[PDB]
Design a protein around this ligand. Structure first.
Ligand SMILES: *[C@@H]1O[C@H](CO)[C@@H](O[C@@H]2O[C@H](CO)[C@@H](O[C@@H]3O[C@H](CO[C@H]4O[C@H](CO)[C@@H](O)[C@H](O)[C@@H]4O)[C@@H](O)[C@H](O[C@H]4O[C@H](CO)[C@@H](O)[C@H](O)[C@@H]4O)[C@@H]3O)[C@H](O)[C@H]2NC(C)=O)[C@H](O)[C@H]1NC(C)=O
Ligand SMILES: *[C@@H]1O[C@H](CO)[C@@H](O[C@@H]2O[C@H](CO)[C@@H](O[C@@H]3O[C@H](CO[C@H]4O[C@H](CO)[C@@H](O)[C@H](O)[C@@H]4O)[C@@H](O)[C@H](O[C@H]4O[C@H](CO)[C@@H](O)[C@H](O)[C@@H]4O)[C@@H]3O)[C@H](O)[C@H]2NC(C)=O)[C@H](O)[C@H]1NC(C)=O
Ligand code: J2G
Ligand SMILES: *[C@@H]1O[C@H](CO)[C@@H](O[C@@H]2O[C@H](CO)[C@@H](O)[C@H](O)[C@H]2NC(C)=O)[C@H](O)[C@H]1NC(C)=O
Ligand SMILES: *[C@@H]1O[C@H](CO)[C@@H](O[C@@H]2O[C@H](CO)[C@@H](O)[C@H](O)[C@H]2NC(C)=O)[C@H](O)[C@H]1NC(C)=O
Ligand code: NAG
Ligand code: NAG
Ligand code: NAG
Ligand code: NAG
Ligand code: LYS
Ligand code: LYS
Ligand code: ZN
Length: 883
């Protein structure tokens, strides 16, 4: 039924490749030219034929195939010369067909040889070109690969599905001014007649096609050896070698931990980490050659803050964990992508907390779960395991549900089974499926070895969307436990609520503590309703200890009153993470209609005595978001009352903040948040100090030691004048620090001149001074402010076709460009314009799940204002009289 490009019929119909021909070994030779910006290449694929067939089906996209032969040492019909193969192209499924002269014999091995060529990509996928700037002002070119999920077919024809694992022998031809890096160590370099060089790399272990990598560049490196003898090297552009020191130290510690914790050595001799100047994701876990964004790998003590230090440590730990969860053990199909991303996201918590406990990443992990709850509490969410077929649908699987929710339900399972039993389970899981593939049921069986308990439990957490809501009622010593599906913007008395609660049931591993006993008590909630008996008549009971469970708790009667009373009288009687969860769940239930906003704002009164930075920053984030929500809607009477309440009720902790980098990680993050909040509210002492620091910095004409914790704040104030704004843009182009450029670009986005904001968008589109990889984050930073809100929304609508040429439809950049310019809307006027814009894109044949997610988010903001805006106005006005 499918027709090929030459008019003939295509002998294959399905998007999935046939299983009759299995690849065993790839011989891959690539000859890129960094002057003509193209390449020629050839390959020889050793395949095993299990079923007699007249054709071979392979993936190939945007590749010109010139030769195609089939040889065999076991089938004499295809001896040493071979037989020519006729190729048929079917771009709709990104497949090609290799028609053989005589049907292949089962159980015999063959060799598929092909010559192919194409230009270097101009985007971020496949084998594409990237540029960087030297300290002297030179621009250099490199060639780099990025294949996950389905872009290996853009560089070489292959069975581009993760189940078709095979060995890879890679050879790269290059000039003497370049080096060549790949997955495996370089075995030898041969000099060619014309003066070129050809690097031969060791044959890889069994691995999926999306992990193949090769780079041609002129980077420098710093090297070190782990305890197991693995040579770790950090690669970066030559003028940035000093910024690779921390990456090497962290990689050595983290790789050693992963080897001991997983009880499985890293199987390769070397592991390279390279900072790519043009890179779309944070990083990519190519086996033995992990590619990074410069902000994800490089660290400069002069311009990188402690939160940047935490960020680099997270990404390195994330990609090194992938060497086991991802490279060693891969999912069968992208429907279970969370087996890689969820575990790698989870192992961040275990590895960073064990290797760098001073970073206090354990407290920051709650933000990972709270972030995905925002999208999981909407109906437009999805189960973490969901079928996916098209390349766009596969790209949509890389979201907060696979990453964040996967890590959070794994942390919940760890707390239910215990660290020792959980660690033993994943060790058996990794050893059982080494160099093979696994699905969800494989993981549940490995963690089972009570058995049917964890499989039936985790089934409801992976095949059902959303997050459950635990409702607790307390009378005397009796506890009535009820579970519902937590919905945002949908009240219980709404007609849609009944239709959204049916056939939703979770096996929730409940954990609770009381005021009489701090001992943790556990109970598995399997049904819709259950009862529990308490030993003593306690004053309160706090469920979900430390928020280890992926569920929200609501208390009926005086439940919240008892807990809020406890916070105002003796807040240290509640665990520090219990306070974080309480502050979080209270404001979530206000949006759910189970609590009025004044009850939530009453809890924030105790924050005057809160010294635990996680809880303090959590409560401040809601008050800060409320202010910006009013500011964007020009509700000046509420925003002014919120500004005065913040600057007055939290004046003690604000005034005692220094403009330095002293203290622990959370001390420095508390400083940056408080001083950013104060300066955003135009607090005169904050503005006077920040403008003084920027003045001295600019008057120095160079870089004086400005504390990194206040670096983003100082630059933001300096960008409020055209003189300082022009100087920052000049400093941006000359900066050798990607972290500083990140902070500088944020400062330029805080300008109130629309001509300056449009210039940044134009520069981001041009991609020369401001790289296009920062366009999505730049549009978001401009849109979240009142002066740039309309500009960004207008730009996305008017230049949609131009944006779709820079990124793929399913790319994460397009997702943030759409969401980052629309999600913060909260008026029916904007909801209509967004609804019409999405409908026009649907007419053009572009469908994304982010469309309904944005629409539901905007409706939630509308209904949140309709239900709580007068309460917020009244509570603030009552506060001006309570003083
Ligand atoms: C990516 O693509 C680029 C562009 O195509 C390649 O760069 C060019 O590579 C070619 C081939 O290496 C270079 O051309 C050669 O230059 C040599 C140096 O020339 C000097 O010496 C001669 C006398 O010997 C003088 O006349 C000349 O003015 C210079 O002073 C020449 O010696 C070579 O000539 C010989 O080779 C050619 C082969 O085609 C013969 O036809 C000639 O008759 C002669 O025998 C040759 O001209 C060229 O200079 C490069 N360009 C640049 C800008 O550097 C990359 O090599 C390629 N990279 C990869 C990895 O593919
Ligand atoms: C494609 O990639 C796969 C990997 O996925 C390769 O398979 C490996 O092949 C090598 C060489 O044939 C094997 O290396 C040998 O390993 C032995 C121990 O292996 C055990 O332990 C590991 C630990 O993880 C298990 O994974 C494994 O299944 C075994 O249980 C060593 O004892 C060997 O060293 C000794 O033997 C050789 C040969 O006699 C001597 O020369 C040495 O000096 C030494 O005395 C050897 O190192 C490896 O085990 C295989 N791995 C797997 C997972 O099967 C393919 O070879 C590769 N294909 C191509 C064409 O490159
Ligand atoms: C492979 O990548 C990651 C590895 C590990 C982690 C981990 O959990 O530590 C996360 C990512 S990520 O891809 O999720 N990273 C990200 C997310 C959101 C944003 C946003 F701008 F929307 F806020 C930006 C980024 N990065 C960081 C700097 C800007 C460039 C991309
Ligand atoms: C973060 O790391 C710390 C330090 O190892 C962990 O605390 C240890 O936990 C084990 C098991 O519960 C105890 O046997 C140790 O005595 C603890 N040590 C200390 C210093 O407290 C902590 O559990 C880790 N956090 C997570 C979430 O895994
Ligand atoms: C909430 O989400 C569910 C699941 O996506 C929706 O149920 C499906 O909705 C689509 C389109 O509305 C229908 O084509 C399907 O037949 C529905 N399936 C079922 C089993 O109901 C539901 O409509 C959504 N509700 C709201 C209010 O958006
Ligand atoms: C391959 O051959 C086996 C041999 O029994 C058969 O069961 C299977 O259906 C065949 N599959 C295809 C796709 O021909
Ligand atoms: C890198 O660090 C060394 C260490 O002494 C120093 O000499 C050199 O000037 C530094 N270079 C850059 C570009 O920071
Ligand atoms: C909070 O609890 C501690 C622990 O008993 C106690 O020492 C402290 O006085 C309490 N705070 C107040 C304000 O009572
Ligand atoms: C905000 O409202 C005031 C009062 O109606 C008006 O003068 C001002 O122009 C408005 N500004 C914006 C940005 O909407
Ligand atoms: N697997 C990568 C993401 C690849 C995204 C490719 N567009 C990770 O660790 O998150
Ligand atoms: N620290 C990163 C930003 C991380 C964004 C997290 N959502 C940077 O330098 O840009
Ligand atoms: Zn990942």
């Amino acid at each position: 039924f499918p027709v090929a490009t030459n008019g003939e019929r295509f002998p294959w119909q399905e998007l999935r490749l046939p299983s009759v021909v299995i690849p065993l070994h790839y011989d891959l030779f690539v000859h890129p030219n960094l002057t003509s910006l193209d390449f020629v290449a050839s390959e020889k694929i050793e395949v095993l034929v299990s079923n007699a067939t007249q054709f071979i089906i392979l993936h190939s996209k945007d590749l010109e195939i010139t030769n195609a032969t089939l040889q065999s040492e076991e089938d004499s019909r295809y001896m040493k010369p071979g037989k020519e193969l006729k190729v048929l192209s079917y771009p709709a499924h990104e497949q090609i067909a290799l028609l053989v002269p005589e049907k292949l014999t089962p159980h015999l091995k063959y060799y598929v040889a092909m010559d192919f060529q194409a230009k270097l990509g101009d985007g971020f996928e496949g084998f594409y070109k990237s540029t960087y700037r030297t300290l002297g002002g030179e621009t250099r070119i490199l060639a780099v690969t990025d294949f996950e999920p389905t872009q290996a077919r853009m560089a070489f024809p292959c069975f581009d599905e993760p189940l078709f694992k095979a060995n890879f022998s890679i050879k790269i031809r290059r000039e003497s001014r370049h080096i060549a890096l790949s997955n495996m160590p370089k075995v030898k370099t041969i000099e060619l007649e014309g003066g070129l060089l050809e690097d031969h790399f060791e044959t890889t272990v069994k691995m999926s096609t999306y992990l193949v990598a090769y780079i041609v560049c002129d980077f420098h490196s710093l090297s070190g050896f782990t305890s197991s003898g693995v040579k770790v090297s950090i690669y970066a552009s030559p003028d940035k070698r000093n910024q690779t020191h921390y990456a090497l130290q962290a990689s050595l510690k983290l790789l050693d931990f992963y080897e001991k914790y997983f009880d499985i050595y890293y199987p390769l001799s070397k592991l390279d980490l390279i900072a790519i100047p043009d890179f779309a994701p944070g990083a990519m876990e190519n086996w033995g050659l992990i590619t990074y964004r410069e902000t994800s790998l490089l660290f400069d003590p002069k311009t990188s803050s402690a939160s940047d230090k935490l960020w680099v440590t997270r990404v390195i730990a994330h990609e090194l964990a992938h060497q086991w969860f991802g490279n060693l053990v891969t999912m069968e199909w992208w429907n279970d992508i969370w087996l890689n991303e969820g575990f790698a996201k989870y192992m961040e918590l275990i590895a960073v907390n064990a290797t760098y406990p001073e970073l206090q990443f354990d407290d920051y992990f709650l933000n990972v779960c709270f972030e995905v709850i925002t999208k999981d509490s909407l109906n437009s969410s999805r189960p973490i395991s969901k079928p996916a077929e098209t390349p766009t649908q596969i790209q949509e699987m890389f979201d907060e549900v696979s990453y964040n929710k996967g890590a959070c339900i794994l942390n919940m399972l760890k707390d239910f089974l215990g660290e020792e039993k959980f660690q033993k389970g994943i060790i058996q899981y990794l050893k059982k499926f080494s160099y093979r593939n696994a699905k969800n049921d494989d993981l549940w069986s490995s963690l089972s070895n009570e058995n049917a308990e964890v499989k039936e439990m985790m089934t409801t957490w992976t095949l059902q969307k959303g997050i459950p809501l635990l409702v607790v009622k307390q009378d005397g010593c009796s506890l009535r436990l009820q579970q519902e599906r937590f919905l945002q913007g949908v009240f219980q008395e709404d007609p849609e609520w009944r239709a959204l609660q049916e056939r939703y049931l979770w096996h929730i591993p409940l954990t609770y503590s009381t005021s009489s006993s701090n001992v943790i008590h556990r109970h598995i909630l399997k049904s819709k309703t259950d009862t529990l008996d308490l030993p003593e008549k306690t004053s309160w009971v706090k469920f979900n200890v430390d928020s280890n469970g992926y569920y929200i708790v609501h208390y009926e009667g005086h439940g919240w009153d008892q807990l809020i009373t406890q916070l105002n009288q003796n807040h240290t009687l509640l665990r520090p993470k219990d306070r974080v969860g309480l502050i979080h769940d209270v404001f979530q239930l206000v949006g759910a209609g189970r609590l009025t906003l004044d009850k939530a704002l009453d809890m924030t009164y105790y924050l005057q005595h809160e010294t635990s930075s996680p809880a303090l920053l959590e409560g401040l984030s809601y008050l800060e978001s409320f202010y910006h929500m009013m500011d964007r809607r020009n509700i000046s009477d509420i925003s002014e009352n919120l500004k005065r309440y913040l600057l007055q009720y939290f004046k003690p902790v604000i005034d005692r903040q220094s403009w330095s980098d002293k203290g622990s990680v959370w001390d420095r993050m508390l400083r940056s948040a408080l001083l950013k909040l104060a300066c955003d509210l135009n607090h005169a002492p904050c503005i006077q100090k920040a403008a003084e620091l920027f003045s001295q910095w600019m008057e120095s004409s160079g870089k004086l030691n400005i504390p990194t914790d206040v670096l983003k704040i100082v630059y933001s104030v300096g960008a409020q004048t055209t003189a300082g704004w022009n100087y920052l843009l000049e400093q941006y182009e000359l900066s050798m620090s990607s972290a500083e450029q990140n902070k500088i670009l944020y400062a330029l986005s805080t300008s109130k001149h629309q001509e300056k904001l449009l210039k940044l968008i134009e520069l981001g589109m041009e991609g020369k001074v401001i790289k296009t990889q920062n366009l999505a984050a730049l549009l978001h930073a401009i849109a979240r402010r009142p002066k740039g809100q309309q500009l960004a929304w207008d730009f996305v609508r008017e230049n949609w076709t131009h944006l779709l040429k820079k990124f793929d439809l399913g790319s994460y950049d397009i997702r943030m460009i759409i969401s980052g310019t629309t999600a913060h809307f909260s008026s029916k006027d904007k909801l209509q314009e967004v609804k019409l814009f999405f409908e026009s894109l649907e007419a053009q044949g572009s469908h994304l799940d982010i469309f309904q997610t944005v629409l539901e988010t905007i409706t939630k903001n509308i209904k949140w204002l309709e239900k709580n805006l007068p309460t917020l106005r009244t509570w603030l006005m009552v506060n001006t009289r309570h003083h």
